[PDB]
């Protein structure tokens, strides 16, 4: 490995090993030989008589230039991977003739054009400006892209634009054993499925990705691999599924969607914003953050509330705050009582001054109500109802700053 750029008149001959050099506008026939070599160019066009061959092996050409189109230049050959990285790396780079793409530190926004099918991008260092991946042919109905984040420490991959791609696979990969969390802003307006894998966290900014109906990070491993996702789906009556991984995840649906959110292992936070949502915390002390009231027929159902889990109701205390204390006895009615009668009994009091919380059990499930209205009738859209699937006792569970911790 030589770190200083070779003089343009200097001949370099690599061997059967993995050699790495920097070139300018060379006037000589540079040969890298066998092995997986790496060549970093500071000029897209070599000098008169100059050429560089990557030789046998899987060879990396690093474009430290503002724009490149190496498949058009016969002076370059034998390079399988194209990396855009360097203090001058920038502009639009032709991916034709390359089977893999890489991205490092850059001087400004980078675009990969003519990206062939089954060609992935690996981000190795924080780039500058938006990275745009333009597929050679995105006309298909089922286009897939494999984006990889690979780093030893936390990697801010920046904004990556994948237009016309229907499935985005994101690998958040840690090369050492110390837990870290990557960040990424995904612009993929045609994506319907996002799948996250790897052994590192991912805080994914998802703004504008309105077609996603599936976020699957269930394969992510590592207790420290925190995954953060906020759904952007705005389709009326849409079904959306959001799965966390092994990490302490923060998963948020959308008000318009019927979100199925599954936290997986770890201390997960599942945020309810509206619709008919289904929350499964999984193992671990999970938090169900209730930020919208919902309606009497479109509310959240928590499938696995257990001792240790919490129920955050700060967002739904329309009037004042829910008083701190242990939950009293459940509301109990007659043998033929309906859910509507249970709802009215829970909301029979006056919540206009300060919202009150009550609970009951009906049909084999447990319900939590927040009454914020003076009337004796449950008011849909003003008073809230939360459903817990099993019969769970909330008698010894206490409210602390509007958070109920199951005991
Ligand atoms: Sr070599
Ligand atoms: Sr080689
Ligand atoms: Sr070429
Ligand atoms: Sr080669
Ligand atoms: Sr090539
Ligand atoms: Sr497409
Ligand atoms: Sr690490
Ligand atoms: Sr929802
Ligand atoms: Sr999790
Ligand atoms: Sr969990
Ligand atoms: Sr749990
Ligand atoms: Sr909240
Ligand atoms: Sr309040
Ligand atoms: Sr009331």
From Swiss-Prot:
This is S-layer protein. The S-layer is a paracrystalline mono-layered assembly of proteins which coats the surface of bacteria. Probably acts as a physical barrier to parasites and lytic enzymes. It is found in: Secreted, Cell wall, S-layer. The calcium binding of this protein may mediate surface attachment by ionic bridging between the S-layer and a specific membrane-associated oligosaccharide.
